[PDB]
Amino acid sequence: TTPRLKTKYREEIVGKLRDEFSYENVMQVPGLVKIVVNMGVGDAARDSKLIEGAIRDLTTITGQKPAVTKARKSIAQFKLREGQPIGAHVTLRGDRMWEFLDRTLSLALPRIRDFRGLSPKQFDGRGNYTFGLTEQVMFHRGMDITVVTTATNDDEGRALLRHLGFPFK
């Protein structure tokens, strides 16, 4: 079963973006490449048990097994030593990416308290988007959403996110 957003993209989004930006070749048209969700429990340096709960939550929300990252460098101020776990992340691709995107946008995103919209200026200057989440109960600890597109700049990516329905200010 092709996800709703995957479909909607193939039939309706692709053409209208091509019309809006007047692209000569269809394959140049930007599209979603992957979705990476990050979580950083710096406190894990004090208690390693905290990470276990993190794996449980992340597994639940997205449906893949996180990969736990280990401290790349030892930093004194954070008493950080190289090699100890500090966080978990997941990289979603294909339909699972599309399905997760449907859930967050259509269900969890409005559940932000006092939500007037997510900022449109949070692009990284290459067409990839990022916005952080302050609480986990948003899904039926803070975690970062990173959207990696094929866009070459911000507006092409912003246009694609618009048309996919993200509520930009």
List, as own/partner pairs, every contact residues 119-123 make where C-beta atoms lie below 8 angstroms and the sequence separation is at least 24, other chains included: 119/168, 119/169, 120/158, 120/168, 120/169, 123/154, 123/157, 123/158
State the residues that interact with RNA by CB under 7 A: 24-28, 34, 36, 38, 40, 64-70, 72, 87, 89-94, 96, 121-126, 128-130, 144, 146, 148
CB of 153 to RNA, least distance (A): 10
CB of 37 to RNA, least distance (A): 8
Torsion of CA 109, 111, 115, 119, to 10 degrees: -20
| Residue 60 dihedral angles phi and psi, to the nearest 5° | -65, -45
What whole-number distance in Å separates Cα of residue 47 and Cα of residue 154?
40
Contact indicator for 151, 126 with CB cutoff of 8 Å? yes
Smaller CB separation from RNA, 26 or 107: 26
What tokens were used for 155? Answer: 């507006």
For the chain, strand residue ranges (E) read 32-40, 67-70, 85-92, 129-133, 143-149
CB of 43 to RNA, least distance (A): 16
Smaller CB separation from RNA, 72 or 81: 72
Smaller CB separation from RNA, 83 or 110: 83
Smaller CB separation from RNA, 68 or 112: 68
Smaller CB separation from RNA, 110 or 132: 132
CA 103 to chain centre: 12
CB of 73 to RNA, least distance (A): 7
CB of 111 to RNA, least distance (A): 22
